[PDB]
Write a structure and sequence with these properties.
By secondary structure, the protein is mainly alpha-helical. The protein is built from one helix and no strands. It is elongated, with a radius of gyration of 16 Å. The termini are far apart. It is a single-pass type III membrane protein.
């Protein structure tokens, strides 16, 4: 039994956190192993 409040907070939290993790991992991975893919 979850409440709209808990669900909303859990959603925004998971989103922001996930974005940060992927953001860093992406920037680092790209900086270490970049590529010439752009058009």
């Amino acid at each position: 039994m979850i409440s709209d409040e808990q669900l909303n907070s859990l959603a925004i939290t998971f989103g922001i956190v996930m974005m940060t993790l992927i953001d860093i991992y992406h920037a680092v991975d790209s900086t270490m192993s970049p590529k010439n893919r752009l058009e």
